Amino acid sequence: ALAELLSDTTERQQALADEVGSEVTGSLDDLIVNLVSQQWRRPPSARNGMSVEVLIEMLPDGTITNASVSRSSGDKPFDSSAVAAVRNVGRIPEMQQLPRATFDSLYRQRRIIFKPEDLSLHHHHH
Ligand SMILES: [Zn+2]
Ligand SMILES: [Zn+2]
Numbered sequence: 001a002l003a004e005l006l007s008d009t010t011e012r013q014q015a016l017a018d019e020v021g022s023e024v025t026g027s028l029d030d031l032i033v034n035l036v037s038q039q040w041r042r043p044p045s046a047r048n049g050m051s052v053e054v055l056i057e058m059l060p061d062g063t064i065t066n067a068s069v070s071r072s073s074g075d076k077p078f079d080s081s082a083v084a085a086v087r088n089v090g091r092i093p094e095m096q097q098l099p100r101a102t103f104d105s106l107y108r109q110r111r112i113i114f115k116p117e118d119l120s121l122h123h124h125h126h
Contacts, residue, residue: 037122040085043077046116
């Protein structure tokens, strides 16, 4: 029965860890998006409907060490504007709130999709 109690408990933790997990990753992806939006300098060719995926590379202390296009929007100036915006954020020390294994698994190399309209939505400070 002890094996059985364990499953039950394991199923249980896997439920909560995933609801908590999703709130965390949601909150951190939101932070990335907002910080990149604040840095973004929109190019004349940007349009609603575009999407660029960028691979963001970080250290556990939150320093960003690289950003590159993982899937192009089809418009090279928008693509480049997203990569520059990422690099310009500089650091996300908020990452230090993660246990290291979670960092390493999810945020050391992370692909985020950026859209001009969402970057414009969040481009203000305060
Ligand atoms: Zn505005
Ligand atoms: Zn502005």
